[PDB]
């Protein structure tokens, strides 16, 4: 039986008046969005930040992801030496990514329906006959090659028409990140992270450290498909995860288990866990709420930026 897409999470299209401050905006939509775990925010049509990373020198070593690593658990000869991590440029990764997807589906990359990639992704995760391997540029600090948003740190040129985006509250470098505590006063910081995706590259189910919010922006490229679970269902999801996990992993601390918590959304739904989905397209924000479990994968070559923030 083929994958059944979860219902769509809310999408908001604020006018310019409502698009003033992200914390005030998220506070207003919270009564609805906290009940779906994730939501999507489309900025006003005329809000188009330039892309401001150092593209000429952009280089990275993406992690290798084997889609069915879990279903193949329960030894193959020379396991552990399948594929080495190597260095790409932004350009050379994109050539590889588009070639992979167009080859895989036998059609131009921009013509593959989002629902077809979604169906194939979940089929491959559980398949013991097809061993698909992809790569994910997922460990890239904005401090390395700069943020995708313009930043007024004097390291890179900003045009007059771009200064607005350097100062915008929706620029992820201008989100509040400091958690309130007494230790924070007794002590004598965080920056955005970047994600360069290809078709089928993915993030497993997790919640943020300290149950933090996160905000996520897709700078350009093909969509990022998301699944989210409201915080009221967090303990339920955790129970399902431990019920259906391999016993070798069921007892592991959550912070380690989250490295390998791959689970088809339909399985959670059949166990009574509410799941919502969305395709985040270029120029759109996704916000995750405190203790909202989420997971997802990329439809093709794309570039995202994300940060944890505090309210
Ligand atoms: C689990 C918490 N965590 C550990 C932090 N510890 C080390 C301190 C994270 O790093 C983290 C937080 N969110 N998050 C994420 C990423 C995306 C995306 O890929 O678009 C979408 C939504 N969330 C990630 C992530 C990073 C890399 C990754 O590689 C495959 C997969 C997930
Ligand atoms: Mn996350």
């Amino acid at each position: 039986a083929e994958f059944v897409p979860p219902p769509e999470c809310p999408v908001f299209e604020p006018s310019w008046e409502e698009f003033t401050d992200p914390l005030s905006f998220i506070g207003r939509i919270r009564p609805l969005a906290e009940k779906t775990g994730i939501c999507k925010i489309r900025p006003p049509k005329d809000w188009q930040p330039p892309f401001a990373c150092e593209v000429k020198s952009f280089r990275f070593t993406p992690r290798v992801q084997r889609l069915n690593e879990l279903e193949a658990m329960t030894p193959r000869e020379a396991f552990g030496f399948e594929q080495a991590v190597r260095e790409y440029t932004l350009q050379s990764f994109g050539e590889m990514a588009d070639n992979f997807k167009s080859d895989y589906f036998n059609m131009p990359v921009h013509m593959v329906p989002t629902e077809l990639v979604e169906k194939e992704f979940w089929r491959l995760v559980s398949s013991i006959e097809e061993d698909v391997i992809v790569e994910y540029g997922a460990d890239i600090s904005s401090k390395d090659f700069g943020s995708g948003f313009p930043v007024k740190d004097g390291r890179r040129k900003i045009l007059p028409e771009e200064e607005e985006y350097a100062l915008s509250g929706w620029n992820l470098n201008n989100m509040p990140v400091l958690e309130q505590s007494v230790l924070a006063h007794i002590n004598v910081m965080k920056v955005p992270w970047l994600y360069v995706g290809m078709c089928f590259s993915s993030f497993c189910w997790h919640i943020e450290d300290h149950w933090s919010y996160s905000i996520n922006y897709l700078h350009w490229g093909e969509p990022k498909t998301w699944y989210g679970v409201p915080s009221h269902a967090a303990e339920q999801l955790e129970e399902v995860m431990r019920e259906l996990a391999p016993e070798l992993f069921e007892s592991q601390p959550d912070l380690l288990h989250q490295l390998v918590t791959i689970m088809n959304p339909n399985v959670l739904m059949e166990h009574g866990v509410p799941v919502y989905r969305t395709n985040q397209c270029a120029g759109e924000f996704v916000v995750t709420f405190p203790r909202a479990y989420h997971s997802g994968f990329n439809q093709g070559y794309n570039f995202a930026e994300a940060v944890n923030f505090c309210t």
Side-chain angles (χ1 to χ4, degrees), residues 184-187 191-241 243-246 248:
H185 297 73
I186 299 168
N187 183 278
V191 292
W193 297 83
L194 314 171
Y195 296 88
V196 188
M198 70 178 283
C199 187
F200 299 139
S201 61
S202 68
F203 50 107
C204 309
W205 290 98
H206 64 279
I207 48 181
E208 299 308 299
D209 288 2
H210 315 300
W211 293 3
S212 178
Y213 288 82
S214 82
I215 182 161
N216 306 254
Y217 183 73
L218 194 64
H219 282 282
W220 46 256
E222 299 187 67
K224 182 181 294 281
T225 297
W226 291 74
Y227 307 100
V229 177
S231 64
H232 72 76
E235 297 206 6
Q236 189 183 18
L237 177 148
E238 292 173 356
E239 178 59 292
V240 172
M241 282 287 178
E243 177 182 351
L244 300 173
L248 292 165

Side-chain angles (χ1 to χ4, degrees), residues 63-70 72-73 75 78-102 104-135:
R63 65 177 72 182
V64 166
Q65 296 190 318
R66 166 151 71 274
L67 266 48
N68 64 359
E69 67 181 355
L70 269 192
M73 252 187 67
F79 70 89
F81 298 91
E82 290 78 12
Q83 186 163 321
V85 165
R86 50 150 289 183
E87 184 181 65
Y88 290 88
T89 66
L90 211 43
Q91 178 180 329
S92 67
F93 187 94
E95 299 168 356
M96 176 274 299
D98 284 348
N99 281 340
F100 168 83
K101 178 179 184 175
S102 63
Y104 192 85
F105 292 99
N106 203 33
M107 48 182 91
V109 299
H110 61 280
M111 296 296 304
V112 187
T114 58
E115 301 93 349
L116 180 55
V117 181
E118 179 173 61
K119 174 163 71 191
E120 268 300 274
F121 178 78
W122 290 113
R123 189 187 68 82
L124 291 168
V125 166
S126 304
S127 179
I128 63 179
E129 291 287 301
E130 192 168 359
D131 305 329
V132 165
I133 302 176
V134 299
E135 286 172 288

